[PDB]
Each structure stands twice: as structure tokens, then as C-alpha cells.
Amino acid sequence: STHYLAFPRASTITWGDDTRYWSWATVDFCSYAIEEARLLQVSWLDCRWSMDASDFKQDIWYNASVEVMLTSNASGWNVPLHLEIELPDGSKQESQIVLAGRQPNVWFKIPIGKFILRSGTIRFGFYNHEGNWKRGLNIRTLAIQA
């Protein structure tokens, strides 16, 4: 069951405020006004939510997902999209996914890992820092469940 939904405005997005690279659109989500982050083009693709471990219950397994959509204009996804949960000790749940040739214009949930706590910043995010242009990824929300 879902503990937190966090919307991309609560995240840090490199070039997030620069309309050459990113855009925002107001939409309804089960009666709540949210803003989707809509990637036009960027090379330093980086989206991180920062939350404290004390926000979460200890001695219980959490899983985290990011809900996204590829547009008809999608390109540059022939590279590994790195998925990361950083715990307060400095350790990392590292995984990757390749978004190339997935169906456009449907929402899908990318799992970004699992964690358990036994106080301090937890980072949830995805990134690709390579010199190619990523285009046409829409971000809806980070979900944290237990």
C-alpha cells in the first residue's frame, strides 16, 4: 500500500526551470492539481527527490517507483537510464533500464529499488549524464509503498 506520492515540483531537476529543455503542465490527478515535468531535450538528465529516513517507518521493506510517459517525439533513450535510491549511510540501490522502443503515450511505473531502515537524507531518482540529447519523457510522480 502507498505511503507517499511525491510530484516532480518537490524534486530537483537539472535545467528544470529552463523552457529550452523542460516544460510543466497543470493536470488533475484524482481531484488534486499536479504539474507534470515534460522533457523537451536535455543532456544532463537528473531528477532527485530528497526525503529524510525519519519520514518513514523502520523495520519494514519499502519499494519506490516513478510513473513516466514517452511522447511521439521520444529519442536518445538508446542509453541506460540509471535508477538510484541513496540511503543516509552513503550506500546505493543501483539499477538501470533502456527506454528505447517502448510504447509511447501510455503511463508505466519504473521500479527504482527497495530499502529497509534500522534518521538522515534518502535520495530517490533517475539520471543519465552522457553527452547525447534525451527527449520526450513526461514525469507524473514518485510512489513509495510498504
Ligand X SMILES: CC(=O)N[C@@H]1[C@@H](O)[C@H](O[C@@H]2O[C@H](CO)[C@@H](O[C@@H]3O[C@H](CO)[C@@H](O)[C@H](O)[C@H]3NC(C)=O)[C@H](O)[C@H]2NC(C)=O)[C@@H](CO)O[C@H]1O
Q: Would you tell me which residues interact with ligand X (CB under 6 A)?
A: 14-15, 21, 42-44, 58-59, 78, 100-101, 118, 129, 131
Name the residue nearer to ligand X (CB basis): 28 or 59. 59
Q: Tell me which of 39, 59, 124, 139 binds a second copy, using CB under 8 A.
A: 59
**Torsion sign across C-alpha atoms 15, 17, 23, 25:** positive
d(CA 45, CA 74): 14
Q: How far is the CB of 5 from ligand X (least distance, A)?
A: 26
Distances (CA, A) of 117 to 5, 38, 62, 146: 19, 33, 9, 12
> Which residue of the chain is nearest ligand X when measured via CB?
101
Q: Answer for the pair 47, 12: CB distance below 8 angstroms, yes or no.
A: yes
Minimum Å distance from CB 102 to ligand X? 7
Q: Does 46 bind a second copy (CB under 8 A)?
A: no
Whole-angstrom distance, CA of residue 119 vs CA of residue 2: 21
Cell numbers 534518521 correspond to 119
What's the min distance (Å) between Cβ of 1 and ligand X? 20
Residues 1-40 that bind a second copy (CB under 8 A): 1-7, 9-10, 17-21, 26, 28-35, 40
Give the number of residues in contact with a second copy, rule: CB under 8 A: 75
